[PDB]
Ligand binder design. Structure first.
Ligand SMILES: [Mg+2]
Ligand SMILES: [Mg+2]
Ligand SMILES: [Mg+2]
Ligand SMILES: [Mg+2]
Ligand SMILES: [Mg+2]
Ligand SMILES: [Mg+2]
Ligand SMILES: [Zn+2]
Ligand SMILES: [Zn+2]
Ligand SMILES: [Zn+2]
Lengths: 241, 295
RNA sequence: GUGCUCGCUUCGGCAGCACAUAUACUAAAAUUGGAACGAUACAGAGAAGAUUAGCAUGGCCCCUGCGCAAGGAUGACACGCUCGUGAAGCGUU
C-alpha cells in the first residue's frame, strides 16, 4: 500500500509539474499543487511551491493570501509573521494584507506592540476604515489620549464634516467636554468657515444644547444668520425649547 | 530556453596541505576547460601537479563551486580546517542542509548557489560556516595533525598483481599486494563521499570516536566532587580555580600531590558537569594534563 | 660523457675545473556506467461524415541538415472556468 501511495503521489506530482510547465503564468495550477501538498502534510514542500509561485508572479493577492493562510492554519506563527512582513513591504496599497495581519496579530497574536506595527500603515495614509478600526482598537485596548492623537491625525489627514462630527462624538463619549468644545471651536474656525457647510454648526448646536441652552440658541442664531431648511429647523427647535 | 550552467573558469585552486605536498616550489599545470566536475557535471579549470618525488600526479576532481560550497578539498574531498570526511563534520554540526540527487535539480541548485556566491563577496561557504562557529566537540580528538602523505602513494600495478609487470623497478606503480576486496571499506562512491551518505570511512571513524569517553564523566552518585589525575605538584589550586571561574561558582577546589589528584566540586550540577567534561583528558594547566574521573 | 691541467704522477687510473640540470593524462591494465534501436511483443496516422494541403504558437522533448534554409504524421506533446452558507472589519440603533 505504501508503494501504491508512492506511485500515486509520483503520478500526481508529475501531472502537476507538467501542468506548471505547460502554462507557467496560470496561478490556479500553483494553488492546486500547493493545496494538494498541504493536504498530504508536507509543509516545506508547499512552502517551496508557494515561493516558486511568488517568484513567477509576486503581484497576485491570492498567492500571498493562500500562503499566509497555510502558514496560519498550521502552528508556524513566526513564518506567517515573516510572510506578512514581506507582503506589507512589497505591496503596501493592498489593505486586505493589513487587515488580516492585524487580525492575526491581535486575536491569535494578542500583542499590543503590533499597534506600533500598525503605525507603519499610518505612514501610508490609508482609507478612513483603517482610522475607524484603529479608533475602535485603541478603545478596545482602553486608551483615550492615544485615540485623541489618532483622531487628531485623522482630522488633519482626512478632513471631513463627518470626520469632525465623529471627533466631537468621540470627545463627548470619552468624558472630555472641554476638549469637545475646543474641537468644535477648531472645526468651526477651520472646516467650512467660508464654505458654509451648515452641518458642523448643527453638531456644535447639539453639543451646546447638551451643555447650555443659551449658547445653543446663540449658535442657532449664528447658523441662521450665516446661512437652508435644516438651519431653519434647528432655529425653530431652539426657539421651541 | 536560455538557462544553462555557466562554466567555472578561475585560477588558484583550493587544496589541502597534505595533497599539496611538502616542497615549497611546485610546478603546476592548468587546463582551461579540461574535464567535467565529478559532482555537478560542469566543465571547470583542471589543475594537475606532482605533490612530491614518488607521488601519483594528483589532479583536481570537483569544481570550485562545489568545493567552496562544502568547504572541502578539490582532490581529497576532505574538510580544509580538520581533514575529516564531510559526513563526520555534518554529524558533528548539522545534517539538515542536503542536496538534490536528480541531475536537472542538481544543476538548477548548483546554478542558484553559483549565482548566490557570485553575488556575494566571492569566498564564503554560505551560512553553514555560520553554523560552524561551535567547534571542538569531539572532532578535534580524532583530527590528524601530521600530513598523511600515504594517500599520495601511487596506484597498485595491475600487471604485478597478475605477475606480469615487465618494467620491474622502472614501473612507477606500486609492486605490492592490494587491500582485501571482501572488506566493505573498499567501495567508496565519490558521490556518497560528497553527500555524506553511508560512507564506510565515516562510519568507522564515528565508531572509533564513540568508543572514546572524553566527555562522559558522571561516575559519582550525584556528587560534584571529581578527581583530575595527572596534575601533581606542577598544577596547583590556582589553575583549578581559574578553570572553574569560567563555570561560575566553585564549591571546592583543591590539589593533593600525595595522590596527584585535583579535587573539583561546584555548587551547580551543570557547572560541575562542564568542569568534568573540560578536564576529561583535554585540559592542560601549568604543564600538567588532567584526566577527570570519580574521586 | 667530452675536453684540459704550472696536477698525483704513472703513462692505466685518481683528483680538480668547464659544458651538459628535471620526460610522462605517468598502463603493455584492473576497474567503473552508460547505451544504436534492430528481433519479438505492446502498439496504431490532427482538424465534430469520409479523404486530406498545411503554416505557426510554449519548452527540463528531440532527430536529419553547414544552416538566421528546409524537412522529420501539420516532427511529437501541449483544454475547462452567473447564488447561498459562514468568518473578519466598518457606520446606525
Ligand atoms: Mg474528419
Ligand atoms: Mg512544407
Ligand atoms: Mg516543420
Ligand atoms: Mg509531409
Ligand atoms: Mg499531411
Ligand atoms: Mg509543428
Ligand atoms: Zn586535498
Ligand atoms: Zn561542481
Ligand atoms: Zn608494475
Amino acid at each position: 500500500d505504501e508503494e501504491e501511495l508512492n506511485d500515486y503521489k509520483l503520478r500526481k506530482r508529475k501531472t502537476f509539474e507538467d501542468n506548471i510547465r505547460k502554462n507557467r503564468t496560470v496561478i490556479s495550477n500553483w494553488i492546486k499543487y500547493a493545496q494538494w501538498e498541504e493536504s498530504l502534510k508536507e509543509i516545506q514542500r508547499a512552502r517551496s511551491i508557494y515561493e516558486r509561485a511568488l517568484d513567477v508572479d509576486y503581484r497576485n493577492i491570492t498567492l500571498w493570501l493562500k500562503y499566509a493562510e497555510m502558514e496560519m492554519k498550521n502552528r508556524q506563527v513566526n513564518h506567517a509573521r515573516n510572510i506578512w512582513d514581506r507582503a506589507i513591504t512589497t505591496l503596501p496599497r493592498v489593505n486586505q494584507f493589513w487587515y488580516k495581519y492585524t487580525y492575526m496579530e491581535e486575536m491569535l497574536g494578542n500583542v499590543a506592540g503590533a499597534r506600533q506595527v500598525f503605525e507603519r500603515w499610518m505612514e501610508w495614509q490609508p482609507e478612513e476604515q483603517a482610522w475607524h478600526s484603529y479608533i475602535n482598537f485603541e478603545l478596545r485596548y482602553k486608551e483615550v489620549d492615544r485615540a485623541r492623537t489618532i483622531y487628531e491625525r485623522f482630522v488633519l489627514v482626512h478632513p471631513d464634516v463627518k470626520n469632525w462630527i465623529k471627533y466631537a462624538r468621540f470627545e463627548e463619549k470619552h468624558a472630555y467636554f472641554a476638549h469637545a468644545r475646543k474641537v468644535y471651536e477648531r472645526a468651526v474656525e477651520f472646516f467650512g468657515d467660508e464654505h458654509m457647510d451648515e452641518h458642523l454648526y448643527v453638531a456644535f448646536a447639539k453639543f451646546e444644547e447638551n451643555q447650555k441652552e443659551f449658547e445653543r440658541v446663540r449658535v442657532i442664531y449664528k447658523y441662521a444668520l450665516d446661512r437652508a431648511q435644516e438651519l431653519f429647523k434647528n432655529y425653530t427647535i431652539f426657539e421651541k425649547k | 530556453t536560455y538557462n544553462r550552467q555557466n562554466w567555472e573558469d578561475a585560477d588558484f585552486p583550493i587544496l589541502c596541505q597534505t595533497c599539496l605536498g611538502e616542497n615549497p616550489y611546485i610546478r603546476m599545470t592548468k587546463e582551461k576547460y579540461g574535464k567535467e566536475c565529478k559532482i555537478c557535471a560542469r566543465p571547470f579549470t583542471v589543475f594537475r601537479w606532482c605533490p612530491g618525488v614518488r607521488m601519483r600526479f594528483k589532479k583536481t576532481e570537483v569544481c570550485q563551486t562545489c568545493s567552496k560550497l562544502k568547504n572541502v578539498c578539490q582532490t581529497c574531498l576532505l574538510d580544509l580546517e580538520y581533514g575529516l570526511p564531510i559526513q563526520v563534520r555534518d554529524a558533528g554540526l548539522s545534517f539538515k542542509d542536503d542536496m538534490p540527487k536528480s541531475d536537472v535539480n542538481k544543476e538548477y541548485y548548483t546554478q542558484n548557489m553559483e549565482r548566490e556566491i557570485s553575488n556575494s563577496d566571492g569566498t564564503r561557504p554560505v551560512g553553514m560556516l555560520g553554523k560552524a562557529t561551535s567547534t571542538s566537540d569531539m572532532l578535534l580528538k580524532l583530527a590528524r595533525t601530521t600530513p598523511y602523505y600515504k594517500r599520495n602513494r601511487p596506484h597498485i600495478c595491475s600487471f604485478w598483481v597478475k605477475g606480469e609487470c615487465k618494467r620491474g623497478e622502472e614501473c612507477p606503480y606500486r609492486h605490492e599486494k592490494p587491500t582485501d576486496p571482501d572488506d566493505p571499506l573498499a567501495d567508496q562512491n565519490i558521490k556518497d563521499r560528497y553527500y555524506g551518505i553511508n560512507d564506510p570511512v565515516a562510519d568507522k571513524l564515528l565508531k572509533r570516536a564513540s568508543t572514546m569517553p572524553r566527555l562522559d564523566p558522571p561516575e559519582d552518585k550525584t556528587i560534584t566532587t571529581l578527581y583530575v589525575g595527572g596534575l601533581g605538584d606542577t598544577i596547583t589550586e590556582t589553575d583549578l580555580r581559574n578553570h572553574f571561574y569560567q563555570f561560575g561558582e566553585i564549591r571546592t577546589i583543591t590539589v593533593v600531590q600525595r595522590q596527584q589528584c585535583a579535587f573539583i566540586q561546584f555548587a551547580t550540577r551543570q557547572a560541575a558537569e562542564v568542569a568534568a567534561e573540560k578536564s576529561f583528558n583535554k585540559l592542560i594547566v601549568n604543564g600538567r594534563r588532567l584526566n577527570v574521573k570519580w574521586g
